[PDB]
């Protein structure tokens, strides 16, 4: 029956870390027998589940995430790991028990001026509740005088934009990251 993983890994365009796109997979069989048959060229990282038992297991749910992040930021997308990107863009819960894949895309995410179309939120009043997608784009304040929209001195549009020129380092390059998170689906 072939559930779509041929678009969660072959789509031309994703969105940013503040706009991490979901894919709700159900009612279907997904041919797992090629995704780990690809000499996991993509960087492949499972928590709790194992690469030898994807065929013989069943689930209520398979939520399939997708976001694009800078190179050194793939440390964040795992339970227990803290810092700015988890605190402000994408929090994982500690008892999340799925598998994470990421791979490099200097192709399709980089001109010589670099794509500035990929955003990231610096700031918010609190750290995230896990798995809370936040499309909030208000003007952040953290001081004694929260004004209306007068920029300067902590009145920022917190969704600043990365640069992704292909002369950057590997820790800065754009990474194409997918979380395979997890009553029908088997193999």
């Amino acid at each position: 029956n072939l559930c779509p993983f041929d678009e969660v890994f072959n789509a031309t365009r994703f969105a940013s870390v503040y706009a991490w796109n979901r894919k709700r997979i159900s009612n279907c069989v997904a041919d797992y027998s090629v995704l780990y048959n690809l000499a996991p060229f993509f960087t492949f990282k499972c928590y709790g589940v194992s690469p030898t038992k994807l065929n013989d297991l069943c689930f209520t749910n398979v939520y399939a995430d997708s976001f694009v992040i800078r190179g050194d930021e793939v440390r964040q997308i795992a339970p227990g790991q803290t810092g700015n990107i988890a605190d402000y863009n994408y929090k994982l819960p500690d008892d999340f028990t799925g598998c994470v894949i990421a791979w490099n895309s200097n192709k399709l995410d980089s001109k010589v001026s670099g794509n500035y179309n990929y955003l990231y939120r610096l700031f918010r009043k609190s750290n995230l509740k896990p798995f809370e997608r936040d499309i909030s784009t208000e003007i952040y304040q953290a001081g004694n005088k929260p004004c209306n929209g007068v920029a300067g001195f902590n009145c920022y549009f917190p969704l600043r934009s990365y640069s992704f020129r292909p002369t950057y380092g590997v820790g800065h390059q754009p990474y194409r990251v997918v979380v395979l998170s997890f009553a029908t689906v088997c193999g």
Epitope: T43, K45, N104, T167, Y168, G169, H172
Partner: antibody, heavy 125, light 106 residues
Framework: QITLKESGPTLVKPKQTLTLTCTFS??????????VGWIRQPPGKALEWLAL???????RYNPSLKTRLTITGDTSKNQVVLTLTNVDPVDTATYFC??????????????????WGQGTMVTVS | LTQPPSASGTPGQRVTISCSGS????????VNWYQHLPGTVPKLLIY???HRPSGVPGRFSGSKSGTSASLAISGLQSEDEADYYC???????????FGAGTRLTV
């Protein structure tokens, strides 16, 4: 289990083209997130870096050497081949093909050479 | 980049290594370190920062205070009579820029 095996001619007259090679083992360059390096060693001076082959033929060279260094990696033949022309006695060195990942299985960027080849004492005379 | 040519130390005291460069590479990207015995192969000693692979003593650590990469030696002994190299990818230079080398005497 990862091993960089390198070979090539070492007894080479000055100023023609030197082609070298390094057969990499223990991994594949069909992997993405992986580079393979080339490193100068002037004995008793320093190291300098030459070039990186990335999996999608992403092309990097040392800004001192643009035209005299062009680089190719044949993943099918499980090797990376180093090409360089018009070769000076200062280019007498030992060259290191080395493995540059970014995996670090708990997923921290490496951006570094973790495994190296032994080296070839390249001589220009 | 910029790296002092050598450093000295008796076998055991806290010995500092320094490295520096511009804001494009070391001031932005992440720093590496290497140990190279004379005549033999070099090897990685610290990658990205402060984190080491299998086979490295945990006493040696780094810091990225802007444009400064600071390898540390504590507990010196005999084996590490070697050239210590800082590299970092450069954004403008589009490549790998090594340090100048630093040999530590025991």
């Amino acid at each position: 289990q990862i091993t960089l095996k390198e070979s090539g001619p070492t007894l080479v007259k000055p100023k023609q083209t030197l082609t070298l090679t390094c057969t990499f083992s223990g991994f594949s360059l069909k992997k993405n997130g992986v580079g393979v390096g080339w490193i100068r060693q002037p004995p008793g001076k320093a190291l300098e870096w030459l070039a990186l082959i990335y999996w999608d033929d992403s092309k990097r060279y040392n800004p001192s050497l643009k035209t005299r260094l062009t680089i190719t990696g044949d993943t099918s033949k499980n090797q990376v081949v180093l090409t360089l022309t018009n070769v000076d006695p200062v280019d007498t060195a030992t060259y290191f093909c080395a493995h540059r990942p970014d995996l670090d299985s708990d997923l921290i960027v490496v951006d570094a050479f973790d495994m190296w080849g032994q080296g070839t004492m390249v001589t220009v005379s | 980049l910029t790296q002092p040519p050598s450093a000295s130390g008796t076998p055991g005291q806290r010995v500092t290594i320094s490295c520096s460069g511009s804001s494009s590479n070391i001031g932005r990207n992440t720093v590496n370190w290497y140990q190279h015995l004379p005549g033999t192969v070099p090897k990685l000693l610290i990658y990205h920062n402060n984190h080491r692979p299998s086979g490295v003593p945990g006493r040696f650590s780094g810091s990225k205070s802007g444009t400064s990469a600071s390898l540390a030696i504590s507990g010196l002994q005999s084996e590490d009579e070697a050239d210590y190299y800082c590299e970092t990818w450069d954004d403008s230079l589009s490549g790998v820029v090594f340090g100048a080398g630093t040999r530590l005497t025991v």
